[PDB]
């Protein structure tokens, strides 16, 4: 029925820690595989933390909110989904102050918010700048996600595909450097060719296929027309459905449908464009009038797509085909190419300039390769997107976590009050990241972690991390594990806000 | 006996009704106060809803009990009549039943208990009305800058106490307008609040007028004009159509070019009627055609296209003009000269980062203002935006219901001491009914002390000691009107701190809570069919 009191805050810890205990070994290059049993007997050995928790069905409300936050984190940043869950589960794993000490939740929440401000200020001191003008410097950073992949052969070209595409979407004039990959960087799979044949195209690509042989094959200055209304038999304002049965109803509607479409298609062919792109569908009788002008017919396109098509050629969107004007042209576009590639007809409205968009073509010999190369270049752009926002890196491999843990410990000595005890627990909660890296290597956890703390006390905290492949201690200046800063800032910020959200709930009551 | 249902009576039925009402109270109990914790609401689909508002929980809470549905309907009466204090009414109504059920086990008949609450609630209203305070600090005295300073001390905006709060006081005083029979209240949306990152956080500046975010379009229009005429038109100067959903198909090709001249020629008649008014500032919500912008440069008028409908409504009240819906007179197009035109003095465009505001200054009758916050970082100025609006409503609500009362548990503590001494002057089995009514009011300062992470026994004890010394002697050396401080967890004077609540909130909360405790107690039997 209902549950309240300390049992809810005690139950939310066991629910959040249980989900965190699953992916503990899924962090690092040594990550252990997990086995999922399907009800029909299927088995999937994938080690991906996002795929495992996606198929797991949990019945606890806080367990659902814990997973949904990780899914949202994956859409914004393509890395760190496992680190958020482990840190958020570790910070809530301390029940000593909640139950034994009988500390009030708002008192502990005040300790996390004061620590979160110092955790962010510490990362900015140990950071390092980045030179984005060097293609080789940006190459060493992206190779972190490229390793152990099928694209490693053409990775030299795959880097230039992801690096140049993000620079195009990046707008430096406004100052905010807004980048949207799912809009302007939108990519489509192209059957045929090899990985080397994948290139970057400036413009928007239409995957529609050529139905009839009469179209414009190559044009110097294309003309693109965009309009909202469709071409078909005029429908009334009511819900009355059109069902063709009697021949008497055939000729009556066919004649009305012929005259209504011919008039709308008349003003279209008067301007004599090189293509017609309509938002809604195009009927068969409407395609007949379009083929008479020797043009390409495009149908079934959305509003956002038309907005990127309009900005590509500099066209104008008109409400109805009757209202079309000479102002709507594709003047300025590069060319129109209906040429077939990979046993499929393509429509190229593209151009030699950068109309605030681009198109990425993926060539491959089979759909199994196109599926792998696609997702390998999606997160590759996610890494390059976060670096160009704030060109500053941070040491990885457990170096940044032990760096902040040392700053919070020395800062706690000046803290006077009861909040100093939970304030120090946050510093020891960040130690789980270097702990899982050593536990996967098979080495001693206590012996290496103790010696790791003494290095940050004397030497600089910017170096002396944990080597994932070897398992020993090594400096981060000699190794390429340097992570972007924008990824870490949202990693700790989300982990703390996730822990606070579950502590603020003291009661769970049903209702409708 | 042969019947079609179950029938039961006795002290168990009254005990079940008290335990049922106690379960509803314990749900909204820990959510009382601004520091109250959030609570999840799970539906049958499995979705979750989280919030700390007690009024929102009671509306979405579903529990089937005969007595529990009475308290749920009770909150609707408090919400529709006033809209605040619904959480406190449910908590007090439960504490009344808890102490009343104990008196029943003492062999006190429920009628004597009901007669006690009616006399106690009546004497409570009389004592409160003497301890009230009217609208003050509007002239000759300022403790009203400390009114919003307390609500602003919980945010990062509270670094400078008198700098940022002084502009909130001047904002609420400038918006005063009667509009009815010497009523005047303080309308909700008046002052436009924006943010800026420029150079420091100390550059926040108050502005008298309306802040309109628009563009001047082409550069041919002047960005400043001294013209008093303000043109307000809802009619679109662009191409006119029959309807958006009804389109006229033109079969004749010659009729196509013939129509294209019609909308072009009609705007030539529409532009002459607008320029005949001599009004420079022009507001068109429906948009302005590109060809019509050229005639604006010839006359030098300042026009804006795609004006927001909500923006023009505030401009009409600021300029003191009337909004023109359409040019249709049912006979011919006319702009209604000398009527829809407004009055102003100086209209100049101000430079803001990435956005340019059109500022209309010193109109005839406005009763509005604008405050632009120039801060440091986006995270810093964003919190200051909602911080001023929150503290503005605090100063507003006090100066609106004109008679307020010190809050923070000062009302329940004073009534507990006075009504307890009043119980001994009555008798006739009315003592226990009135005495338990005084103890039941202590739950409000008790609940606020627990949610504040403080000891509830010590704060209530120190709170009762202050109000008692006020009843002993009038002399000033004894504390008077002392409330509770949630931030520091100690006693504090709410008169100087500026934490107030309207009178009708506390008075109607005690009446409805009394009627609910009586209605549930009057049920001696449960009959089922």
Alpha-carbon gap, residue A345 to A367, rounded angstroms: 18
Those residues of chain A whose CB sits closer than 8 Å to some CB in chain B are 2, 4, 61, 64-65, 104-107, 174, 229, 234, 237, 259-260, 263-264, 266-267, 319-320, 322, 504-512
**B48's tokens:** 């979750």
Q: Is B155 annotated as a binding residue?
A: yes
Tokens of A32: 């252990």
Residue A198, C-beta contacts closer than 8 angstroms, at least 6 positions apart: A154, A157, A158, A161, A360, A361, A362, A363, A364, A373
Contacts 24+ apart (CB under 8 A), B415-423: B415/B124, B415/B127, B415/B128, B415/B441, B416/B441, B416/B442, B416/B464, B416/B467, B417/B464, B417/B467, B417/B468, B417/B471, B418/B123, B418/B127, B418/B471, B419/B120, B419/B123, B419/B124, B419/B127, B421/B471, B422/B120, B422/B123
Beta strands per DSSP E along A279-418:
296-298, 317-318, 347-348, 359-364, 392-394
Does residue B218 have a known ligand-binding role? no
**Exposed, middle or buried: residue A415 (CB in 10 Å: 0-12, 13-18, 19+)?**
middle
Token output for A233: 């038999």
Cβ within 8 Å, pair B249-A509? no
Alpha-carbon separation of residue B341 from A251, B75, B232, B281, B344 (angstroms): 59, 47, 7, 10, 10
How far is the C-alpha of B526 from the C-alpha of B192, rounded, in Å? 57
Contact (CB<8Å) A505/B50: yes
> Nearest residue of B to residue A260 by CA position?
B249
**B205 — phi, psi (to 5°)?**
-135, 135
Q: Which one of A60, A322, A507 would you mutate to disrupt binding with B, by most B Cβ within 10 Å of its Cβ?
A: A507
Q: Does B60 touch chain A if contact means CB atoms closer than 8 Å?
A: yes
- Test the A interface: residue of B32, B40, B451 with most A CBs within 10 Å: B40
B39, B249, B256 ranked by CB distance to A507: nearest: B39
CB-based contact B69:B413 (threshold 8 Å): no
Contact assignment for A507 to B60 by CB distance below 8 Å: no
DSSP state of B401: S
- For residues A174 and A172, give the distance between their C-alpha atoms in angstroms, rounded to a whole number: 6
B22 touching chain A per CB within 8 A = no
CB within 8 Å: A511 and B62 = yes
- Choose among A2, A507, A511: nearest Cβ to B43: A511
Q: Are A383 and A79 in contact, with CB atoms under 8 Å apart?
A: yes
B3 touches chain A (CB under 8 A): no
Q: Is A190 helix (H, G, I), strand (E, B) or coil?
A: strand
User: Residue B354's CB: how many other CB atoms inside 10 A?
Assistant: 9
* Rounded Cα gap, residues A394 and A486, in angstroms: 10
- Please indicate whether residue B390 is annotated as part of the active site: yes
B408 among the known binding-site residues? Answer: yes
Angle (CA) B383 B384 B387, round 5°: 90
* Chain B contact set for A60 (CB, 8 A): none
Helix crossing, B161-174 with B378-400: angle to 10°? 50
Closest alpha carbon to A225 in A336, A352, A356, A324: A324
Q: What is the dihedral of CA A181, A182, A185, A187, to 10 degrees?
A: 130
Q: Does B154 carry a binding-site annotation?
A: yes
Beta strands of A179-223 (E only): which ranges?
187-191, 200-201, 205-206
Catalytic amino acids of A? 48, 81-82, 379
- All residues of chain A having their beta carbon less than 8 Å from the beta carbon of residue B251 are 259, 263
Binding residues of A for ADP are: 28, 80-83, 148-149, 397, 468-469, 483, 488
Long-range CB contacts (within 8 A, 24+) of A113-119: A113/A496, A113/A500, A114/A419, A114/A423, A115/A408, A115/A423, A115/A426, A115/A496, A116/A492, A116/A493, A116/A496, A118/A407, A118/A408, A118/A411, A119/A404, A119/A408, A119/A426, A119/A492, A119/A496
Q: For residue B141, how many C-alpha atoms fall within 13 Å in the half-sphere facing its CB?
A: 6
A512/B62 touch (CB, cutoff 8 Å), yes or no: yes
Alpha-helix runs per DSSP H in A281-366: 284-291, 303-313
Q: First and final CA of chain B: distance in angstroms?
A: 14
A359: closest CA among A510, A190, A133, A222?
A: A190
B78 CA: distance to closest CA in chain A (Å)? 22
Query: Measured between CB atoms, does B242 come within 8 Å of chain A?
Result: no
Q: Using the beta-carbon criterion (under 8 Å), do A264 and B249 form an inter-chain contact?
A: yes
Integer Cα distance of A60 and A52 in angstroms: 17
- CB spacing of B60 vs A511 below 8 angstroms: yes
Give the pair of three-digit tokens for residue A145.
């996600």
> Running DSSP on this structure, what letter comes out for residue B407?
-
For residues A446 and A443, give the distance between their C-alpha atoms in angstroms, rounded to a whole number. Answer: 9
Q: Which helix (H) or strand (E) holds B348?
A: strand B346-351
Chain A residues lying within 8 Å of B253, measured CB to CB: 266
CB contact under 8 A, A506 and B43: no
User: Is A105's CB within 8 Å of B37's CB?
Assistant: yes
Give the residue on A whose Cα is nearest the Cα of B247. Answer: A320
Strands A200-201 and A473-474: unpaired
Residue identified by tokens 């055939």 is A250
CB contact under 8 A, B27 and A509: yes
CA separation for the pair A250, B245 (Å, rounded): 27
Residues contacting residue A186 through CB under 8 Å, at least 6 positions apart: A359, A360
What gap in Å lies between CA B321 and CA B317, rounded to an integer? 7
Question: Crossing angle of helices A105-125/A399-411, nearest 10°?
Answer: 120
Which alpha helices (DSSP H) does B236-377 contain, by range? 253-275, 290-299, 309-319
B85 is in an annotated binding site: yes
* Given the residues B79, B137, B234, B390, the one annotated as active site: B390
Residue A8 and residue B42 in contact, taking contact as beta carbons nearer than 8 Å = no
Q: Which residue of B has its CA nearest to A175?
A: B354
d(CA B301, CA B283) in angstroms, rounded, equals 11
Cβ–Cβ under 8 Å, residues B139 and B173: no
**What CATH number is given to the structural domain containing A299?**
3.50.7.10
Q: Is B249 on the interface with A (CB under 8 A)?
A: yes
> Domain of B214?
208-399
Determine which one of B87, B363, B447, B503 is catalytic. Answer: B87
Q: Is there a contact between A322 and B249 if contact means CB atoms under 8 Å apart?
A: yes
Domain housing A254: 205-387
Using CA atoms, how far apart are residues A234 and A254, in angstroms rounded to an integer?
11
A322 chain-B contacts, CB cut-off 8 A: 247, 249-250, 256
- A-chain residues within 8 Å CB-CB of B40? 61, 505, 507-509
A 10 A CB-CB count for B401 gives 17
* Contact status, residue A456 vs residue A464, Cβ threshold 8 Å: yes
Kind of pairing between the strands at A317-318 and A224-227: parallel
Per-residue buried b or exposed e for A64-92, using 16+ beta carbons within 10 Å of the residue's own CB: bbbbebbeebbeebbbbbbbbbbbbbbbb
Residues A138 and A141: their CA atoms lie apart, in Å, by 5
Taking CA atoms, what residue in B is nearest to A324?
B256
**How far is the CA of B157 from the CAs of B149, B238, B381, B383, in angstroms?**
10, 46, 9, 8
- Using a 10 angstrom Cβ sphere, with 0-12 exposed, 13-18 middle and 19 or more buried, the burial of residue B369 is buried
Scanning B358-502, the segments in alpha helix (DSSP H) are 378-400, 410-422, 431-440, 443-451, 456-472, 494-497
Per the annotation, where are the binding residues of A for Mg(2+)? 79
Beta carbon pairs, A and B, within 8 Å:
76
CB contacts of A510 in chain B (<8 Å) are 41-44, 62
Instruction: Determine the distance from the C-alpha atom of residue A158 to the mean position of all C-alpha atoms in its chain, rounded to a whole number.
Output: 18
Neighbours of A193 (CB within 10 A): 16
Helix locations, A170-321, DSSP H = 247-270, 284-291, 303-313
From A64, A320, A509, residue closest to B41, measured CB to CB:
A509
In this complex, which of B37, B43, B249 lies closest to A260 when CB atoms are compared? B249
Mapped onto helix, strand or coil, the DSSP state of residue B7 is strand
Q: Is B53 a catalytic residue?
A: yes
- Tell me chain B's radius of gyration from C-alpha atoms: 31
Q: B32, B34, B37: which to substitute to probe chain A, counting the most A Cβ within 10 Å?
A: B37
Note whether A103 and A21 are within 8 A (CB).
Answer: no
CA distance A240 to B320: 50
Min distance A172 CA to chain B CA atoms (Å): 14
The phi and psi torsions of B383 (rounded to 5 degrees) equal: -65, -35
CATH number of domain containing B364: 3.50.7.10
Residue B247 forms contact with A (CB below 8 Å): yes
CB atoms within 10 A of CB A259: 12
Which one, of A37, A311, A364, A12, lies nearest residue A188 by Cα?
A364
CA-based nearest distance B348→chain A, Å:
26
Task: Select from A322, A506, A509 the Cβ nearest to the Cβ of B250.
Answer: A322
Contacts of B39 in chain A (CB under 8 A): 505-509
């Amino acid at each position: 029925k209902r549950e309240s009191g300390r049992k809810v805050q005690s139950g939310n810890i066991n629910a959040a820690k249980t989900i965190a205990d699953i992916i503990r070994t899924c962090l690092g290059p040594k990550s252990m595989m997990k086995m999922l049993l399907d009800p029909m007997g299927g088995i999937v050995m994938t080690n991906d933390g996002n795929a495992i928790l996606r198929e797991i069905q949990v019945q606890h409300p806080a367990a659902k909110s814990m997973i949904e936050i990780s899914r949202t984190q994956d859409e914004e940043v393509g890395d760190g989904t496992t680190s958020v869950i482990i840190l958020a589960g570790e910070m809530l794993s301390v029940a000593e102050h909640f139950l034994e000490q009988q500390m009030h939740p708002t008192v502990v929440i005040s300790a996390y918010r004061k620590a979160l401000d110092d955790m962010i200020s510490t990362l900015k001191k140990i950071s390092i700048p980045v030179d984005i003008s060097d293609s080789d410097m940006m190459l060493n950073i992206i190779n972190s996600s490229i390793t152990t992949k099928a694209i490693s052969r053409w990775s030299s070209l795959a880097c230039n595909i992801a690096l140049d595409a993000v620079k195009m979407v990046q707008f430096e004039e406004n100052g905010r450097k807004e980048i949207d990959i799912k809009k302007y960087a939108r990519v489509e799979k192209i059957p045929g060719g090899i990985i080397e044949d994948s290139c970057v195209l400036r413009g928007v690509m239409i995957n529609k296929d050529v139905t009839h042989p009469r179209m414009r094959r190559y044009i110097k200055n294309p003309r693109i027309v965009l309009l909202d209304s469709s071409l078909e038999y005029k429908k009334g304002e009511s819900q009355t459905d059109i069902e063709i049965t009697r021949e008497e109803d055939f000729t009556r509607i066919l004649q009305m449908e012929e005259e209504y479409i011919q008039q709308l298609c008349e003003d279209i062919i008067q301007l004599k464009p090189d293509v017609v792109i309509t938002e809604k569908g195009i009927s068969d009788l409407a395609q007949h009038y379009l083929m008479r002008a020797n043009i390409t017919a495009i149908r079934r396109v959305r509003k956002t797509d038309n907005n990127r098509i309009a900005r590509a050629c500099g066209a104008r969107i008109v409400s109805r085909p009757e209202e079309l004007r000479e102002d709507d042209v594709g003047t300025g576009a590069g060319l129109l190419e209906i040429k077939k590639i990979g046993d499929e007809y393509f429509t190229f409205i593209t151009d030699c300039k950068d109309p605030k968009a681009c198109t990425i073509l993926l060539r491959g010999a089979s759909k199994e390769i196109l599926s792998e190369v696609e997702r390998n270049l999606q997160d590759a752009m996610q890494v390059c997107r976060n670096v160009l926002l704030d060109p500053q890196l941070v040491p990885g491999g457990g170096a940044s976590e032990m760096a902040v843990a040392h700053a919070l410990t020395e800062k706690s000595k000046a803290m006077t009050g009861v909040e100093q005890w939970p304030y120090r627990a946050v510093a020891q909660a960040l130690e789980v990241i270097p702990r899982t890296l050593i536990q996967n290597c098979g080495a001693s956890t206590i012996r290496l972690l103790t010696s790791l703390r003494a290095k940050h006390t004397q030497e600089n905290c910017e170096t002396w991390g944990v080597n994932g492949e070897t398992g020993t201690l090594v400096d981060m200046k000699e190794l390429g594990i340097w992570e972007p800063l924008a990824v870490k800032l949202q990693t700790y910020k989300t982990a703390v806000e996730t822990a606070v959200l579950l502590l603020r709930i003291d009661d769970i009551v049903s209702g409708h | 006996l042969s019947v079609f249902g179950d029938r039961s009576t006795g002290e168990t039925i009254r005990s079940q009704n008290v335990m049922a009402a106690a379960s509803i109270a314990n749900i909204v109990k820990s959510s009382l106060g601004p520091v109250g914790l959030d609570k999840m609401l799970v539906d049958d689909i499995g979705d979750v809803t989280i919030t700390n508002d007690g009024a929102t929980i009671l509306k979405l809470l579903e529990v089937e009990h005969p007595a529990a549905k009475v308290l749920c309907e009770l909150a609707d009466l408090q919400d529709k009549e006033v809209g605040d204090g619904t959480t406190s009414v449910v908590i007090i109504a439960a504490e009344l039943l808890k102490n009343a059920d104990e008196l029943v086990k003492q062999k006190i008949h429920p009628t004597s208990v009901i007669s006690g609450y009616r006399l106690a609630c009546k004497e409570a209203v009389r004592y409160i009305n003497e301890n009230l305070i009217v609208n003050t600090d509007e002239l000759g005295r300022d403790c009203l800058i400390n009114a919003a300073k307390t609500s602003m001390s919980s945010k990062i905006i509270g670094i400078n106490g008198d700098f940022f709060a002084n502009m909130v006081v001047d904002a609420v005083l400038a918006i005063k307008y009667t509009d009815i029979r010497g009523q005047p209240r303080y309308p909700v949306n008046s002052v436009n609040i924006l943010k800026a990152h420029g150079r420091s956080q100390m550059e926040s500046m108050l502005i008298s007028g309306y802040a309109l975010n628009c563009v001047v379009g082409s550069q041919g229009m002047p960005k400043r004009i001294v013209n008093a005429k303000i043109a307000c038109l809802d009619f679109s100067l662009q191409k006119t159509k029959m309807k958006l959903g009804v389109q006229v198909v033109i079969t004749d090709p010659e009729k196509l070019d013939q129509i294209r001249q019609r909308e072009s020629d009609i705007t030539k008649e529409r532009i002459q009627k607008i320029l005949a008014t001599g009004a420079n500032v022009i507001l068109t919500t429906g948009g302005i055609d590109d060809m019509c912008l050229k005639y604006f440069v010839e006359a030098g008028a300042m026009a804006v296209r795609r004006v927001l409908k909500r923006d023009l409504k505030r401009i009409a009240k600021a300029s003191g003009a009337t909004i023109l819906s359409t040019l249709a007179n049912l006979e011919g197009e006319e702009t209604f000269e000398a009527a829809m035109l407004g009055q102003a003095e100086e209209v100049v465009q101000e430079r803001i980062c990435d956005d340019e505001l059109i500022l209309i200054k010193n109109t005839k009758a406005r009763t509005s203002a604008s405050i632009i916050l120039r801060g440091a970082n986006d995270f810093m100025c964003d919190e200051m935006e909602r911080s001023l609006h929150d503290a503005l409503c605090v100063v507003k609500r006090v100066l609106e219901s004109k008679s307020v009362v010190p809050g923070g548990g000062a009302v329940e503590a004073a009534l507990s001491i006075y009504l307890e001494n009043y119980a001994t002057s009555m008798g006739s089995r009315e003592q226990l009914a009135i005495a338990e009514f005084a103890r039941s009011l202590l739950v409000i300062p008790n609940t606020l002390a627990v949610n504040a992470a403080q000891d509830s026994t010590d704060l209530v004890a120190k709170l009762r000691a202050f109000h008692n010394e006020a009843q002993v002697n009038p002399e000033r050396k004894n504390l008077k009107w002392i409330g509770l401080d949630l931030s520091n967890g100690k006693p504090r004077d709410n008169k100087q701190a500026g934490v107030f609540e309207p009178t009708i909130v506390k008075v109607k909360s005690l009446k409805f809570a009394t009627e609910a405790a009586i209605t549930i107690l009057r049920i001696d039997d449960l009959i089922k069919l």
